């Protein structure tokens, strides 16, 4: 029915600014009370501020005052979130909800990473399976992806084939600026000299699809 359409993922430098859309294609607009909530990595939602067209004016939450500015151009049934003086903790998934309280429908979100680092495909290193990588009849290899920016990066093994016992860890933010993760797959000891083990990392923010092969 009514749908919220947000803008594309943004990688702004630690100091730039940013405006975000959030088109609303359902029924009315005028009354639908738009609201903007952001959510850092594994953090609670955080209401940045909302507004109401027919009333034009909006209010923003304290810490976000002076550096934030959310508008709405009903003539387009859209809302705009303006966030200036950017820092590194402003990085997160920005949502814009509606409630025409309660707050019914939401958007798909928006990924705005802020950090003084430039885009970069990741390296890739074989977490090779040896003595210190087994127990019982189970050995476990894995792939260490490293130094990329920004999020995210997918990882499929044997091009989709391998499915069981594969833990693709969450990304990790580094002092450096770039993230890094890895994916171990605990398989059968025996199945080492017999089967092939190749991970499929891929980072589209920088058009890349590296492929490695873990071995003893």
């Amino acid at each position: 029915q009514v749908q919220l359409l947000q803008s594309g993922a943004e990688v702004k430098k630690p100091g730039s600014s940013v405006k975000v859309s959030c088109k609303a294609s359902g029924g009315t607009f005028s009354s639908y009370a738009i609201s903007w909530v952001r959510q850092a990595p594994g953090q609670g939602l955080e209401w940045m501020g909302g507004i109401i067209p027919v009333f034009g004016s909006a209010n923003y939450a304290q810490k976000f005052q002076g550096r934030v500015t959310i508008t709405a151009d009903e003539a387009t049934s859209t809302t705009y979130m303006e966030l200036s003086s950017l820092r590194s903790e402003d990085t997160a998934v920005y949502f814009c909800a509606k409630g025409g309280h309660g707050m019914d429908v939401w958007g798909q979100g928006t990924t705005v990473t802020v950090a003084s680092a430039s885009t970069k495909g990741p390296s890739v290193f074989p977490l090779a399976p040896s003595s210190k990588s087994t127990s019982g009849g189970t050995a476990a290899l894995g792939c260490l992806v490293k130094d990329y920016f920004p999020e995210p990066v997918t990882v499929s093994w044997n091009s989709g084939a391998l499915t069981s016992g594969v833990h693709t860890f969450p990304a990790v933010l580094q002092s450096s600026g770039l993230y890094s993760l890895s994916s171990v797959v605990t398989v059968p000891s025996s199945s080492l000299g017999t089967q092939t083990y190749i991970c499929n990392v891929n980072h589209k923010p920088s058009n890349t699809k590296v492929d490695k092969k873990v071995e003893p």
Partner: protein, 211 residues
Amino acid sequence: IQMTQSPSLSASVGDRVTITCRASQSISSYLNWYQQKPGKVPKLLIYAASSLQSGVPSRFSGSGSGTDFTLTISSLQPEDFATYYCQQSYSTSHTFGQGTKLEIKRTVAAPSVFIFPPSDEQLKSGTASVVCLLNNFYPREAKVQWKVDNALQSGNSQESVTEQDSKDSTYSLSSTLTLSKADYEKHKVYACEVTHQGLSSPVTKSFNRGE
């Protein structure tokens, strides 16, 4: 203005619960509840302090006034293990509570350690990460000490944790200790002792570089 919620809670399937969200100043009945699971968007559960959104199972029920409120669920299901956030929708500035992740309780599972010494392409690239993995354990609070040449580390090691698994509901952690080529080549042993709610004795995994 604020809103107070504790962080976690671990329950079983069927168990009954109540997530309490208290408020600083009084809000009456302008508190709302939302349910959100990972990589997904918030789905409104309750609003009006006690009024079930459309499509919400009867196990869900809101209750409470003034400054303190309650999300109570009836019997518990695979699906209800999400993160519930309360939100004050009374003032000018809606406020959220920090959120309560309900995770599935189950029986202890001591982790099985793994210590992947550095690759080669990395070492030649200029640095060296040392991966100490922990596969399928529960609960989620497993501690990992990093030791180098018998010295206690801190700052150079980064950890990460897989989101709880639907099938066996376990956890898998992964500490990754990164150093600089030189730095790395100038030390012998490399172990990571793990103390865990499941191990009466901290397990140690290591390897003497250059071997």
